[PDB]
Amino acid sequence: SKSSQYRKMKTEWKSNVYLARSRIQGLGLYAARDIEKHTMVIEYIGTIIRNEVANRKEKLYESQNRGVYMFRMDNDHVIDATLTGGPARYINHSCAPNCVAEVVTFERGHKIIISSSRRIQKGEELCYDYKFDKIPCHCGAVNCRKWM
Numbered sequence: 781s782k783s784s785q786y787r788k789m790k791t792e793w794k795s796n797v798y799l800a801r802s803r804i805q806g807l808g809l810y811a812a813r814d815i816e817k818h819t820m821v822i823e824y825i826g827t828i829i830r831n832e833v834a835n836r837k838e839k840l841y842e843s844q845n846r847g848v849y850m851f852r853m854d855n856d857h858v859i860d861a862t863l864t865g866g867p868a869r870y871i872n873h874s875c876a877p878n879c880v881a882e883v884v885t886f887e888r889g890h891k892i893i894i895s896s897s898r899r900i901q902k903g904e905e906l907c908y909d910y911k912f913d914k915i916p917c918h919c920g921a922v923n924c925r926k927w928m
């Protein structure tokens with residue numbers, strides 16, 4: 781049951797991850813322990829805001845040469861982790877991910893859950909495919925698409 785998986789992950793995620801210097805860019809999130817395939821690791825949390833508001837914010841931050849932490853969604857909304865976020869905001873992109881950022885809709889709502897797509901060893905850096913629609917990718921993978 782997704783909702784039981786979710787409830788369990790919500791009380792465990794702190795022991796699933798840690799924050800350290802990335803092998804990809806800046807800071808990154810790492811598996812604190814071994815994690816089985818198809819397992820909820822952590823949630824992307826923040827404040828859901830309309831695209832219009834998000835764009836204004838991004839534009840304001842770029843003026844000071846700062847990035848934002850935002851997970852773009854299909855409903856013209858965004859989860860804004862720039863001010864109130866969690867560790868999942870630090871998970872980097874990979875052309876060869878060990879994770880997926882999946883939509884999970886259930887009793888408690890419409891959530892973005894990061895889950896393992898393979899067995900993941902302690903100390904591996906976590907990453908998922910950001911899925912793009914233009915700056916160079918540093919995921920290091922063999923089949924890197926070179927750009928983001």
Ligand SMILES: Nc1ncnc2c1ncn2[C@@H]1O[C@H](CSCC[C@H](N)C(=O)O)[C@@H](O)[C@H]1O
Pocket residue numbers: 802804805806807808847849869870871872873874875916917918919928
């Ligand atoms: N595979 C990749 N190659 C190059 N830059 C990446 C990347 N994955 C993530 N990033 C960078 O990280 C941002 C997502 S925020 C993720 C955490 C970030 N590494 C940090 O230290 O704050 C992107 O805007 C991009 O600047």
Ligand SMILES: [Zn+2]
Pocket residue numbers: 874875876917918919920921923924925926927
């Ligand atoms: Zn890449």
